Paper text:
CHD4 is an essential, widely conserved ATP-dependent translocase that is also a broad tumour dependency. In common with other SF2-family chromatin remodelling enzymes, it alters chromatin accessibility by repositioning histone octamers. Besides the helicase and adjacent tandem chromodomains and PHD domains, CHD4 features 1000 residues of N- and C-terminal sequence with unknown structure and function. Auto-inhibition is relieved by a previously unrecognized C-terminal SANT-SLIDE domain split by ~150 residues of disordered sequence, most likely by binding of this domain to substrate DNA.
After generating many constructs covering the region 1200–1912, we were able to successfully express and purify a protein comprising residues 1380–1810, but lacking residues 1552–1689. These residues form part of what is predicted by PONDR25 to be a disordered segment of ~160 residues in length (residues 1540–1700). We determined the three-dimensional structure of this polypeptide by X-ray crystallography to a resolution of 2.9 Å. Furthermore, our X-ray crystal structure of C1bC2a reveals a SANT-SLIDE domain that closely resembles the structure observed in both CHD1 and ISWI. First, no clear electron density was observed for the residues that constitute the bulk of the second helix of the SANT domain (α2 in human CHD1). Second, a β-hairpin that links α3 and α4 in human CHD1 has ‘relocated’ to a position N-terminal to the first helix in hCHD4; Fig. 5B shows the high sequence similarity between these two elements. Third, the SLIDE domain features an additional N-terminal helix in hCHD4. The most obvious difference, however, is the absence of electron density for the extended linker sequence (which is 60 residues in length in the truncated construct used for crystallization). To test this hypothesis, we titrated 46w60 nucleosomal DNA (without histones) with purified CHD4(1380–1810) in an MST experiment. Figure 5C shows that WT C1bC2a can bind DNA with micromolar affinity, consistent with our hypothesis that the C-terminal region of CHD4 harbours a SANT-SLIDE like DNA-binding domain.
Residue numbers in the entry: 1400 to 1439, 1445 to 1468, 1488 to 1520, 1696 to 1808
Write the structure that this text describes.
Amino acid sequence: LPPLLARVGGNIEVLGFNARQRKAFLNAIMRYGMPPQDAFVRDLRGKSEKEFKAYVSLFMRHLCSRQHVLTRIGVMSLIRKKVQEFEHVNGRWSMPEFMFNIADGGFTELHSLWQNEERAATVTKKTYEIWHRRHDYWLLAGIINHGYARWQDIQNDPRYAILNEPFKGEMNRGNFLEIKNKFLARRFKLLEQALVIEEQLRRAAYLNMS
């Protein structure tokens, strides 16, 4: 109901939103992506649902850092599709107290990585201590529950303790929290690619026919 463009108290408000709300919004979009139609907001605490969608749809038109926001919003949607695809069979706890695949068609090293990694996880039976396909699901699951590139919030969550298990050897190293963060970032960057490639493969399979 507020005006798209207005001047109140010495500042410009876009649909009732001040810069503080306007900046906060973007920060929460880069971190979580777009809420799917509806979903659970700090500076925007007082904002209502009525005003919320007013901004989103108005933000949408704007989109079509312009590309930056576009890709981050899309990527986070790709991750949400994948996690939801297998959420049921895997549960919500990595190490309690399984199924996962990404169809990149062999265009990223992932499938070759997964093969070698899963060989050792099975022959040694050390499932949680050898990073493999299983760990990438829970890495992706964390990126949704906790946000984009939130390695520390993900690590501290018991739900994703599997991500910590392959690195118990270097707990005494001063840089410990870094080595982990550098592995997760280098890993998620690959997953990001495979996720995007799988989408381009699904979309081209339709030959541009809905």
